[PDB]
C-alpha cells in the first residue's frame, strides 16, 4: 500500500510537468538542457537566500507567530525574481519559449529539492497522511505561480512597456513575491484546515494568473 | 617482476593482512 | 594466397617478437661493454638511430 | 680518488626488485585501465587497518601531515608516500650537489634509481621500526615483541607495495606519476569525505553529523529555528563549516586562474615554412615540486623532533628542536609543539592564534615563502629544466625561435625561467598561507597539491589523446 | 563589442574621432602582438579591428 | 648601510623582474578559465567520488575486523 | 621621415629620442634605430609596449 500510496503521490506531483514540457513546444526547441541549467541557477540562489538570510537576520525567539520574520522572508524571495530575470537573459527565444523555460526549471528545481524528499520518505510510510497528496497539488500550484511570476518579470524587463501599465506589472510582481507571507499569515489568523488554505492558494495563484494573462495579452496586442 | 606479479603480491599481502586480522579474533576468542 | 592471408596475424605476431629479441640483445650488448668510452659511443649512435626513426615516422605521419 | 656510492651499493640492488618495461607501447585504454586498477589497490590499503595495534586515543600530531603524504593513521599506509618522498629528495639533492657524481652510462642510472629505491625502503623500514618503538599504538611492552615485529614488517611490505606501483605507473604502464595520483585521490578523498560523511559524532550537546551538508540538512530539518541552525552551521567550532567548504571552493577557482597564467614564446619549425607554435613557460613553472620538498623536509623535521623530545626529555637541543605537548581542548587529541623550531615552522589554526602570536605567524610566512622559493630555484637546476635544458630538448625536436639561433634561445628562455621559477613559488607560498588562513577544507597545502596535479594529469590525457 | 554603423550616426565628430583614435590603439597593440607572438583569438581580431575603423572613417566622411 | 643594500638590490631586482613577468604573462580568457575549472572539476570529482565509495564500503568492513 | 619618425615616437610612446638612423630593407620596408634620451631606457619602454 505503501508503495502504491508513494507512487501516486510522485505521479501527481510529476506528471503536470512533463505534460506542460510537452505541450508548450519545449521539447521541439531540445530545451531540457536549458531547464536544467535554470535549475542549477534555481540552486545557487536558493543557497545565496540562505546564507544572507542567516548572515543579516537573527531568530526571533518569541513563541507568537514570527509575523517579521515571514515578512523578511518573503522580501529575500525577490532574490528568486532576480534568478529568474537571469535565466530570462541567458536564454534566448520568444518571450513564451523565454517565460516557459525559466518557469519549468525554476518549478522543477524546487520540486526535486523541497517536496521529494519530503515524498520518498513520508509517503512510504505506514501511516497514511492527505499531507502527501496535498503537498503534490501544491507542486502544481507553484509551478503555475512561477509561470505567472516568470511572465510578470518578463514583461517589467520588455523594453517597449508602456509607463501606464508598468505600475499594474510592479503592483503584480509585489503580490507575487508577498502571496507566501500572505497566505501563511491569513492561515494563521483564521486557523484554516489543511484542505482550505491549499484551495485559497490555487484561488490566488488563479487570479494572479488571469490577471497576468490579461495584463500579457494586453501588452501584446498594443504592439500588435 | 612483471605488472601482473606485482598486482598478485598486492592482492595476496591484503588477502593476508585480512587472514591476520582474523586469526586474531578467533585467537582472542 | 587465401590461406596466407589467414596466417597474416600469426606471421606479423612472430615478426614483432624477433625483433623485441634482437632489440633485447643489442641493449644487452650495450650493458655488457667493459668500455664506458665504446658503451658511450654505442648508445649515443643507437638513441640518434632511434631519433632518426621517429622523425621519419613524423615525416611519413605528415 | 672516491670509490663510487653506486658502486658500492651495485650489490644490493640485485636484491632490489625492478619492474620490466613494457615490451610494446601500451595501448591508452590499457594505460587508463593500470591507472584505476593501481589506485584502487592504494585506496584498499588506504584503508586497511594495521594488525594488533591498541586501541589508544593518543593525540595525532601529524594529522595536517598525512594528508599531504596520502597517510591514513592505523592503516597500511600510516607511512604514507613519506619514505620514498624523502628518498627522492635526498638522492636528488646529491646529485645537484655533486656529492655524488652519476655517469651518462646506464649502469650509472640504473645504478642511480636503484639507490634512491634502496633509500626508500631502508627510510621505511627505520620509520617503521621507529613508529612501533616510540608508543604510537601503545607501550612496547604491553604489545609484545611479536606484535611489534609483525606491525614492522606490515608497513614494510605496505611500503614496499606503495614503490613497485609508482614505479610501475611512472614506467609508463598507467598514467602520469603514482605518488602524485595517490596525493591527488586522498586530498580528494579527504575534501569529500568531510563535505559529505554520514558519521555522527557525540557532541557534547547532541550528536552531530561530520558532514558539512548533510549536518546543514539536518540540522535545518530538525530545528525549529532554520536560521539559527544555518549560522551554527556555518560557525560551528568543533566540525567542518559550510563557510570553510566556501573557502575552499573559492581558494580551488582561484589557484585555477593563477595556474593559467602563461608566458607565450613563439616558436617556429625551423624546417618547415607556416608551423607556429607557443612555448608556454607556466607562472608555477617549477609544479607542486617545491611544496613537496618543503612539505617533505618539514615533516622529516617533526618525527625527527618528536623522537628526540620523546627519548631524550629535557636537553636543549632536543628543546630547541621541539617540545610536544597533547592539547585535548574539548576536541580529539591533538599534539602540538609548544617551543623550538617546529613551533615556528607549525601553521598558526586561526587569525585568532595569528593575533595572539605575530611574531610565529610572520616567522612562518617568512619561512614558506623563502622555502618554496629557494626550493624552486633549486629544482630548476637539478631537475634539467633549465633555460639550456629546454633550448636542447627544442633543437633535438628542431624547434626554433623566430629571427632567433638556438643560442639566442637559451639567453632568452634564461630570462623568464628564473624569474618565473621564483616568483611562482613565492606565489604558491602566498595561497598557501592565504588558504590555510581561511581555513579551507584539506588544508590550503593538499588544495593546491590537488588543483595542480590534476591540471597536470588533465594535460597528460589532452596530450595522449 | 561588435561595432555596427546604425548607432554610430548619432554620436559626435569628437565622440567618433575618441573612438578612432582608441581603435589606432588597439592596432597598434594587435600589429605588436603578431610580431611578439600571440594567440589566434588575437591574430583573428586584425580583421575585425580594421574593418571597424573603416566603418567609423565612413560615418565620419 | 652596505650589506642593507647588498640585501635590497638583489630582493629589488627580483621585484622588478616578477613585475615584468606578469606583465608579460597572458592572462586565462574566459573560455579557457571555464574549460580547466570544468576538466578540474570532473577530475576532482571522480577521485573524491571513488574515495568516499572506498572508505565508505571499508567502514562496516573495519568495524567487524577491528570492533569485536 | 627621420622628423616624423622622432615626432611620431614621441606621441605613441612618450619618450624623448636621442637620434634616428633609417635604412630601406631589400624587402622594402624601412627599417629605422631610434636611439632614446640619456635617462630613458629602451630595454623598459620595450618592456612596457610589448617587445621583450
Known amino acids: 500500500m505503501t508503495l502504491f500510496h508513494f507512487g501516486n503521490c510522485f505521479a501527481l506531483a510529476y506528471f503536470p510537468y512533463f505534460i506542460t514540457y510537452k505541450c508548450s513546444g519545449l521539447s521541439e526547441y531540445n530545451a531540457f538542457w536549458k531547464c536544467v541549467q535554470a535549475g542549477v541557477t534555481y540552486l545557487f540562489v536558493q543557497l545565496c537566500k540562505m546564507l544572507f538570510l542567516a548572515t543579516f537576520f537573527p531568530t526571533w525567539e518569541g513563541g507568537i507567530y514570527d509575523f517579521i520574520g515571514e515578512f523578511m522572508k518573503a522580501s529575500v524571495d525577490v532574490a528568486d525574481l532576480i534568478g529568474l530575470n537571469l535565466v530570462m537573459s541567458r536564454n534566448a527565444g520568444k518571450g513564451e519559449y523565454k517565460i516557459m523555460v525559466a518557469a519549468l526549471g525554476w518549478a522543477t528545481a524546487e520540486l526535486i529539492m523541497s517536496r521529494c524528499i519530503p515524498l520518498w520518505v513520508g509517503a512510504r510510510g505506514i501511516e497514511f497522511d492527505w499531507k502527501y497528496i496535498q503537498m503534490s497539488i501544491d507542486s502544481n500550484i507553484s509551478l503555475v505561480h512561477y509561470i505567472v511570476a516568470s511572465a510578470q518579470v518578463w514583461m517589467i524587463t520588455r523594453y517597449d512597456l508602456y509607463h501606464t501599465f508598468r505600475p499594474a506589472v510592479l503592483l503584480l510582481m509585489f503580490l507575487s513575491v508577498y502571496k507566501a507571507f500572505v497566505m501563511e499569515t491569513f492561515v494563521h489568523l483564521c486557523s484554516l484546515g489543511s484542505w482550505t488554505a491549499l484551495l485559497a492558494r490555487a484561488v490566488v495563484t488563479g487570479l494572479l494568473a488571469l490577471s497576468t494573462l490579461a495584463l500579457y495579452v494586453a501588452v501584446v496586442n498594443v504592439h500588435s | 617482476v612483471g605488472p601482473v606479479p606485482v598486482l598478485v603480491m598486492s592482492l595476496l599481502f591484503i588477502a593476508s593482512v585480512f587472514m591476520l586480522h582474523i586469526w586474531g579474533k578467533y585467537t582472542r576468542s | 594466397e587465401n590461406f596466407l592471408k589467414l596466417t597474416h596475424v600469426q606471421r606479423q605476431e612472430a615478426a614483432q617478437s624477433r625483433r623485441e629479441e634482437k632489440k633485447r640483445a643489442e641493449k644487452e650488448r650495450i650493458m655488457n661493454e667493459e668500455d664506458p668510452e665504446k658503451q658511450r659511443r654505442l648508445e649515443e649512435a643507437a638513441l640518434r638511430r632511434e631519433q632518426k626513426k621517429l622523425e621519419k615516422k613524423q615525416m611519413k605521419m605528415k | 680518488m672516491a670509490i663510487k656510492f653506486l658502486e658500492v651499493i651495485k650489490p644490493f640492488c640485485v636484491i632490489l626488485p625492478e619492474i620490466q618495461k613494457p615490451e610494446r607501447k601500451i595501448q591508452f585504454k590499457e594505460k587508463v585501465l593500470w591507472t584505476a586498477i593501481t589506485l584502487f589497490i592504494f ?78 625502503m631502508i627510510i621505511t623500514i627505520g620509520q617503521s621500526i621507529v613508529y612501533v618503538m616510540t608508543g604510537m599504538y601503545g607501550d612496547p611492552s604491553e604489545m609484545g615483541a611479536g606484535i611489534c615485529l609483525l606491525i614492522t614488517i606490515q608497513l614494510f611490505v605496505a611500503g614496499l607495495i606503495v614503490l613497485l606501483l609508482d614505479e610501475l605507473l611512472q614506467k609508463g604502464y598507467g598514467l602520469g606519476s603514482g605518488i602524485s595520483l595517490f596525493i591527488a585521490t586522498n586530498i580528494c578523498e579527504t575534501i569529500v569525505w568531510k563535505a559529505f560523511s554520514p558519521t555522527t ?34 560557525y560551528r567550532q568543533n566540525l567542518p563549516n559550510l563557510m ?83 592539547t585535548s581542548s574539548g576536541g580529539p587529541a591533538r599534539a602540538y609543539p609548544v617551543g623550538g623550531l617546529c613551533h615556528y615552522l607549525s601553521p598558526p589554526e586561526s587569525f585568532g592564534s595569528v593575533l595572539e602570536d605575530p611574531v610565529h605567524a610572520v616567522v612562518y610566512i617568512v619561512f614558506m615563502l623563502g622555502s618554496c622559493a629557494f626550493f624552486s630555484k633549486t629544482w630548476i637546476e637539478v631537475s634539467g629544466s633549465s633555460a639550456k635544458d629546454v633550448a636542447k630538448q627544442l633543437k633535438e625536436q628542431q624547434m626554433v625561435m623566430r629571427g632567433h639561433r638556438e643560442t639566442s634561445m637559451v639567453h632568452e628562455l634564461n630570462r623568464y625561467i628564473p624569474t618565473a621559477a621564483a616568483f611562482g613559488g613565492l606565489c604558491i607560498g602566498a595561497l598557501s598561507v592565504l588558504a590555510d588562513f581561511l581555513g579551507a577544507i584539506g588544508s590550503g597545502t593538499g588544495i593546491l597539491l590537488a588543483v595542480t596535479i590534476i591540471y597536470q594529469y588533465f594535460e597528460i590525457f589532452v596530450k595522449e589523446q | 563589442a561588435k561595432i555596427k554603423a546604425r548607432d554610430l550616426r548619432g554620436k559626435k565628430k569628437e565622440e567618433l574621432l575618441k573612438q578612432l583614435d582608441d581603435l589606432k590603439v588597439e592596432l597598434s597593440q594587435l600589429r605588436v602582438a603578431k610580431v611578439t607572438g600571440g594567440a589566434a583569438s588575437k591574430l583573428s581580431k586584425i580583421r575585425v579591428v580594421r574593418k571597424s575603423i573603416a566603418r567609423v572613417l565612413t560615418v565620419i566622411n | 648601510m652596505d650589506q642593507v643594500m647588498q640585501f635590497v638590490e638583489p630582493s629589488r631586482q627580483f621585484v622588478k623582474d616578477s613585475i615584468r613577468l606578469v606583465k608579460r604573462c597572458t592572462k586565462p580568457d574566459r573560455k579557457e578559465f571555464q574549460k580547466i575549472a570544468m576538466a578540474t572539476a570532473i577530475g576532482f570529482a571522480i577521485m573524491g567520488f571513488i574515495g568516499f565509495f572506498v572508505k565508505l564500503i571499508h567502514i562496516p568492513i573495519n568495524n567487524i575486523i577491528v570492533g569485536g | 621621415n627621420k622628423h616624423q619618425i622622432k615626432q611620431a615616437v614621441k606621441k605613441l610612446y612618450d619618450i624623448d629620442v636621442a637620434k634616428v638612423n633609417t635604412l630601406i630593407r631589400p624587402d622594402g620596408e624601412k627599417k629605422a634605430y631610434v636611439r632614446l634620451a640619456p635617462d630613458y631606457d629602451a630595454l623598459d619602454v620595450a618592456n612596457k609596449i610589448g617587445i621583450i
Not at chain 4, 249 to 256: D, G, K, Q, S
Not at chain 4, 257 to 270: N, T
Request: aromatic fraction near 12%; proline fraction near 4%; charge should be positive.
Open chain 4, 43 to 120: 585506496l584498499v590499503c588506504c584503508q586497511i587497518p594495521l594488525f594488533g595495534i591498541m586501541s589508544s586515543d593518543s593525540a595525532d600530531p601529524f594529522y595536517w601531515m598525512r594528508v599531504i603524504l596520502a597517510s591514513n593513521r592505523g592503516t597500511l599506509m600510516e607511512l604514507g608516500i613519506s619514505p620514498i618522498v624523502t628518498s627522492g629528495l635526498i638522492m636528488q639533492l646529491l646529485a645537484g650537489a655533486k656529492i655524488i657524481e652519476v655517469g651518462d652510462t646506464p649502469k650509472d642510472r640504473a645504478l642511480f634509481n636503484g639507490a634512491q629505491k634502496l633509500f626508500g
Open chain 4, 244 to 326: 570553510n567548504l566556501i573557502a575552499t571552493i573559492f581558494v580551488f577557482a582561484v589557484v585555477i586562474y593563477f595556474q593559467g597564467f602563461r608566458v607565450d614564446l613563439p616558436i617556429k619549425s625551423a624546417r618547415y615554412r607556416g608551423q607556429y607554435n607557443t612555448y608556454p613557460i607556466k607562472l608555477f613553472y617549477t609544479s607542486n615540486i617545491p611544496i613537496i620538498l618543503q612539505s617533505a623536509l618539514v615533516s622529516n623535521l617533526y618525527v625527527i623532533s618528536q623522537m628526540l623530545s620523546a627519548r631524550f626529555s629535557g636537553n636543549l637541543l632536543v628543546s630547541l628542536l621541539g617540545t610536544w605537548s597533547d
Open chain 4, 201 to 234: 559524532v557525540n557532541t557534547g550537546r547532541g550528536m552531530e553529523f561530520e558532514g558539512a551538508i548533510i549536518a546543514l540538512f539536518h540540522l535545518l530539518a530538525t530545528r525549529t529555528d532554520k536560521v539559527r541552525a544555518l549560522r551554527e552551521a556555518f
